Point group: C6
Chain length 30, copies 6
């Protein structure tokens, strides 16, 4: 269904935001 | 339908966030 | 309708995230 | 209504993402 | 209700994006 | 339900944005 589809794309956005934080943590460490 | 339209725009946001993470690796 | 309004604001968010990616590439050079 | 409330918070998120791009543009310019 | 719950989490995301923009000024 | 699932993923996004803000403050030092 369509609401499940929306939840799955939000899950994808959360994964990429976690990736952004991960790369920034590396930048913070030099 | 409009709910599918919403899912498609969320897909676009996820793609751009992926791009942001990738560009940060070049910093 | 309201659901169309939600899709249009999501389109706006995707556009700004694309701008963010563009500027980060400029910073990395 | 509740769907209008959701649209208004998305509008707020878009404004802040525009702000993020604006500050990054300044960083890119030194 | 659940739609109000969704609006409240969106409010939280907007607050954090505002914080991100502010921290970038210190860079 | 599905609407609760959507709220929970939004909560996850807000948590990651908070992590992003934390790391940017660390970078600025």
């Amino acid at each position: 269904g369509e609401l499940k589809a929306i939840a799955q794309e939000l899950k994808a956005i959360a994964k990429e935001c976690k990736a952004i934080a991960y790369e920034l943590k590396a930048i913070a460490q030099g």
